Enzyme design. Structure first.
Site, PDB file in Angstrom:
ATOM      1  N   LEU A   1       0.826  -1.193   0.000  1.00  0.00           N
ATOM      2  CA  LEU A   1       0.000   0.000   0.000  1.00  0.00           C
ATOM      3  C   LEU A   1       0.865   1.250   0.000  1.00  0.00           C
ATOM      4  O   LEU A   1       1.993   1.249   0.502  1.00  0.00           O
ATOM      5  CB  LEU A   1      -0.933   0.022   1.212  1.00  0.00           C
ATOM      6  N   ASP A   2       0.321   2.317  -0.576  1.00  0.00           N
ATOM      7  CA  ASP A   2       0.910   3.640  -0.475  1.00  0.00           C
ATOM      8  C   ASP A   2       0.676   4.181   0.938  1.00  0.00           C
ATOM      9  O   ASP A   2      -0.087   3.614   1.726  1.00  0.00           O
ATOM     10  CB  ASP A   2       0.302   4.555  -1.545  1.00  0.00           C
ATOM     11  N   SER A   3       1.354   5.279   1.276  1.00  0.00           N
ATOM     12  CA  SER A   3       1.140   5.878   2.590  1.00  0.00           C
ATOM     13  C   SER A   3      -0.234   6.518   2.687  1.00  0.00           C
ATOM     14  O   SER A   3      -0.883   6.432   3.732  1.00  0.00           O
ATOM     15  CB  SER A   3       2.212   6.912   2.888  1.00  0.00           C
TER      16      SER A   3
ATOM     17  N   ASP B   1      -2.861   5.475   1.262  1.00  0.00           N
ATOM     18  CA  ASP B   1      -3.747   4.350   1.537  1.00  0.00           C
ATOM     19  C   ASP B   1      -3.855   4.087   3.033  1.00  0.00           C
ATOM     20  O   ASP B   1      -4.952   3.868   3.554  1.00  0.00           O
ATOM     21  CB  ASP B   1      -3.237   3.108   0.812  1.00  0.00           C
TER      22      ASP B   1
END
Ligand SMILES: CCCCCCCCCCCCCCCCCC(=O)OC[C@H](COP(=O)([O-])OCC(O)COP(=O)([O-])OC[C@@H](COC(=O)CCCCCCCCCCCCCCCCC)OC(=O)CCCCCCCCCCCCCCCCC)OC(=O)CCCCCCCCCCCCCCCCC
Ligand SMILES: CCCCCCCCCCCCCC(=O)SCCNC(=O)CCNC(=O)[C@@H](O)C(C)(C)COP(=O)(O)O
Ligand code: SF4
Ligand code: SF4
Lengths: 96, 208, 82, 113, 114, 176
Positions: free
Chosen positions: C38-40, C42
């Site tokens: 996941l991205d941050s 996210d």
């Protein structure tokens, strides 16, 4: 200007002013729409002698600003000019 | 040089030189240059950490009393690494005089807001945010003032083009005014006007 | 909020509503960045969904450290009694 | 004579202008004693404040005091005394008699470029 | 190389500010879809917010991301306080703009731009 | 050198107080205002009967543009592009070439009348009095591109209005 003197009198009474002396509509008191041709004068530099441009060159007497201080005793405290003179009240109509 | 030449005012030149020395020696912590133009306008070129102390001085000192902020101005000069030149035009009604206070910043260094000194600056430096991108620290409500609400770019920067990057039109499909990339039906015609001859030898810069 | 098991089931329900997390690989000790991928941002919207579910505000200094559902259920446990 | 109005909106008439100016000038000098002696703000402000204080102590009249302090009405002379006091209290904190904090870049004030 | 900061002393405070701005935009998107009565979904608006945040995601300077957070807060204040119209919100969705040629061959076909 | 608007103390004797109270209760200044409005009611209005009566213009008036000719039919424009150099809105577009008799003449003289600011810098930059800004102000169109004049339209405006343009220049050329 073509108002009847009854309407003119009613109008001057209602306004309180002599309106015919100062009309806001213009009549034959204005200038002609056709004028005689002008003969406009010349300035002071229209001369045939002693008229060198270097002796009247305004743009080439402008200098760069004199750097008073740069970062490369009991002297008097100064102001940017003398203090402004107090304005005098009008002798014409002070409303006083 | 009487009729067509502007008469030189030597008295104001001497008085503004004396007051420029006065301000330069009262405030040597921030004053970098002091100059007086040939048409008798005093400029105090300062360090940007002294925006508040110099402007509070000139507003409040009994020999200055520059109570009015006439105009607040930025100038983009892209050849300087501090490309933005912030200009404070001030008016003393007591001594009937004008002074100019000049400082500098680049794109990222904030200038301290002078709303605590002059409330007039509240919109002016706000406009310097909108037109130049100079951020002003501790401004009460700093936001855009002149551009459109979705406007990207700081227009009075000299790398910003004359026509922008977008143009509006109404679009009847979406029933809405839309923004598109600008296409001119006639390009603005750049004129190279500058003469190849030196006009003012008094302003000749020393060569490399 | 009364028991830790109901908080854990509700955390996992909020995480499986979140469409980017694969619900098979969603576990209690799975990591957001390196396991779930996941991205941050996210993780930030996961924490905002946790605030939507659990009815309190999570600040920034204690949401950067929430990298697994077990840390989430521990943080919800610590701001309550259980 | 009890001047009715100052003419400036919001600048109220002072009942005792001489005592208020003596208080403000001695308070400016008391604040100004906490500045180092070689600082030009201290020397110049002591000079002009002692000049104004001697003019106040030399003239009992209010009108003649206005016409020889030469700063307009006496109430805006009081306002300028309050402004100088606030200024000197800020000049203690700023310490602007220090050397220049940073030289500019080499062509920062070069015009034209 | 010693510069005066805007708000952030380092990049971690900067990422904190980026994160709080993203939280505020994420909360704002449903209200923006509703009161501007947009034709997009809330998910599509949050996708546009995520796209605009990821557009600037390569910056390593704290002052530049401080100005990016400041400009995002300004756009957010123009959205919450209804100062933008519908058109300014919909300018993020370049809808009437035709899609540009992306590969080499179609840019060769249409003209001269590289 | 200054005066005080509104620094009058009203008199407090019973005469002036009763005058102000008769003003308050009997509406005397309101009848004064009704009298002045009634006074304009019986004046002849200042209304001219447009389009049959026209507003007075001077010979300096800056209206519609026209390319002029000599008294031989030769067009005055010798393609020097001074008008488009001075043109503050860049409304003038000029292209030129030597024509069949070798004369320096334009092949394009366009004026966008919707960029034009009607300031007449072109007619004072012009060294041969070719472009002028004539006396026509009643040339409103129904379409935007009808206000995009080419050389044919401007030469036809010159041929249309020349009898008037020459007399206006005859009136004002000794001021120029
Ligand atoms: C009050 C009732 C109206 C009485 C008539 C009247 O006051 O006439 C204006 C007449 C002229 O007033 P004025 O404003 O000085 O007129 C100056 C004009 O330049 C003088 O007028 P003019 O030089 O312009 O002369 C031409 C004008 C002549 O004007 C008239 O014939 C006046 C209208 C008469 C009806 O005729 C027209 O323009 C044709 C107008 C036709 C329609 C008039 C209205 C009809 C109303 C009923 C239907 O007023 C008087 O003579 C004084 C008031 C008379 C009141 C009489 C007692 C009641
Ligand atoms: C409806 C339409 C509304 C559109 C909304 C437009 C909002 C525009 C605001 C723009 C503000 C920004 O983009 S500032 C972001 C720049 N940040 C950086 O350069 C620092 C790097 N930041 C990141 O990588 C961020 O993803 C995080 C979350 C801080 C950390 O992630 P990394 O770890 O993985
Ligand atoms: S009147 Fe002015 S704006 Fe119009 S074409 Fe002439 S120079 Fe250009
Ligand atoms: S109209 Fe006059 S100024 Fe313009 S190109 Fe022709 S001759 Fe030159």
């Amino acid at each position: 200007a073509s108002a009847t003197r009854l309407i003119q009198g009613l109008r001057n009474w209602a306004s309180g002013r002599d309106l015919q002396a100062k009309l806001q509509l213009r009549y034959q008191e204005i200038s002609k729409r056709t004028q005689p041709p002008p003969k406009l004068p010349v300035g002071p530099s229209h001369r045939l002698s002693n008229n060198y441009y270097c002796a009247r060159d305004g743009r080439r007497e402008a200098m760069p600003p004199s750097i008073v201080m740069s970062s490369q005793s009991e002297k008097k405290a100064v102001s940017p000019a003398p203090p402004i003179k107090r304005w005098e009240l009008s002798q014409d109509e002070p409303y006083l | 040089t009487r009729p067509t030449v502007r008469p030189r005012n030597d008295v104001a030149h001497k008085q503004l030189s004396a007051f420029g020395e006065y301000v330069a020696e009262i405030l040597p912590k921030y004053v970098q240059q002091v100059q007086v133009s040939c048409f008798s306008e005093l400029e105090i070129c300062i360090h940007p950490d002294g925006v508040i102390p110099v402007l509070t001085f000139l507003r409040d000192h009994s020999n200055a009393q520059f109570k009015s902020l006439a105009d607040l101005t930025a100038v983009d000069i892209p050849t300087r690494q501090n490309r933005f030149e912030i200009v404070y035009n001030l008016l003393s009604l007591r001594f009937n005089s004008r002074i100019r206070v000049k400082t500098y910043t680049d794109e990222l260094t904030p200038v301290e807001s002078s709303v605590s000194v002059y409330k007039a600056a509240n919109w002016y430096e706000r406009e310097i945010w909108d037109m130049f991108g100079v951020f002003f620290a501790n401004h009460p409500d700093l936001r855009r003032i002149l551009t459109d609400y979705g406007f990207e770019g700081h227009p009075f920067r000299k790398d910003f083009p004359l026509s922008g990057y977008v143009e509006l039109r109404y679009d009847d499909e979406v029933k809405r005014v839309v923004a598109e990339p600008v296409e001119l039906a006639q390009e603005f015609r750049k004129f190279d006007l500058n003469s190849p001859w030196e006009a003012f030898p008094a302003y000749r810069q020393p060569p490399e | 909020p009364l028991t830790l098991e109901g908080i854990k089931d509700r955390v996992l329900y909020v995480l499986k509503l979140y469409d980017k997390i694969d619900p098979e690989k969603l576990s209690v000790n799975s990591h957001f960045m390196k396991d779930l991928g996941l991205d941050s941002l996210d993780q930030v919207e996961i924490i905002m969904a946790m605030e939507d579910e659990f009815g309190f505000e999570i600040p920034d200094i204690d949401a950067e450290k929430l990298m697994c559902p077990q840390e989430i259920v521990d943080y919800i446990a610590d701001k309550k009694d259980v | 004579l009890l001047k009715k109005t100052t003419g400036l909106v919001g600048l109220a008439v002072c009942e005792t202008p001489h005592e208020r100016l003596k208080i403000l000038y001695t308070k400016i000098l008391d604040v100004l004693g906490h500045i180092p002696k070689n600082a030009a703000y201290r020397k110049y402000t002591e000079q002009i404040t002692n000049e104004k204080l001697s003019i106040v102590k030399a003239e009992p009249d209010v009108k003649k005091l206005e016409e020889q302090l030469q700063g307009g009405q006496i109430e805006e002379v009081i306002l300028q005394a309050e402004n100088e006091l606030s200024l000197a209290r800020k000049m203690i904190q700023w310490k602007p008699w220090e050397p220049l904090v940073e030289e500019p870049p080499a062509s920062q004030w070069k015009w034209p470029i | 190389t010693s510069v005066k900061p805007i708000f952030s002393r380092d990049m971690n405070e900067a990422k904190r500010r980026v994160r709080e701005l993203y939280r505020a935009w994420y909360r704002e998107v449903p209200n923006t879809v509703h009161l501007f009565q947009l034709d997009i979904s809330v998910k599509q608006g949050r996708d546009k917010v995520r796209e605009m945040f990821k557009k600037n995601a390569h910056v390593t300077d704290p002052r530049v991301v401080d100005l990016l957070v400041i400009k995002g807060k300004m756009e957010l204040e123009e959205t919450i306080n209804v100062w933008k119209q519908r058109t300014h919100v919909m300018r993020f969705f370049h809808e009437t703009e035709a899609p540009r040629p992306k590969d080499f061959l179609s840019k060769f076909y249409v003209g001269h731009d590289p | 050198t200054y005066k005080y608007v509104n620094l009058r103390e009203p008199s407090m004797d019973m005469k002036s107080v009763t005058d102000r109270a008769a003003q308050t209760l009997l509406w005397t200044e309101l009848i004064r205002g009704l009298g002045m409005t009634l006074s304009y009611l019986f004046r002849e209005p200042a209304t001219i009967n447009y389009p049959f009566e026209k507003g007075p213009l001077s010979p300096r008036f800056r209206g519609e543009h026209a390319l002029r000719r000599y008294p031989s039919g030769e067009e005055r424009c010798i393609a020097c592009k001074l008008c488009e150099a001075v043109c503050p809105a860049q409304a003038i577009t000029i292209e030129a070439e030597p024509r069949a008799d070798g004369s320096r003449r334009t092949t394009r003289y366009d004026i966008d009348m919707t960029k034009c600011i009607y300031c007449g810098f072109c007619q004072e930059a012009c060294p041969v009095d070719a472009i002028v800004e004539g006396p026509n102000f009643e040339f409103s169109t129904e379409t935007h591109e009808e206000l995009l004049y080419n050389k044919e339209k401007l030469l036809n405006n010159g041929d249309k209005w020349e009898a008037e343009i020459a007399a206006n220049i005859q009136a004002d050329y000794l001021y120029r």
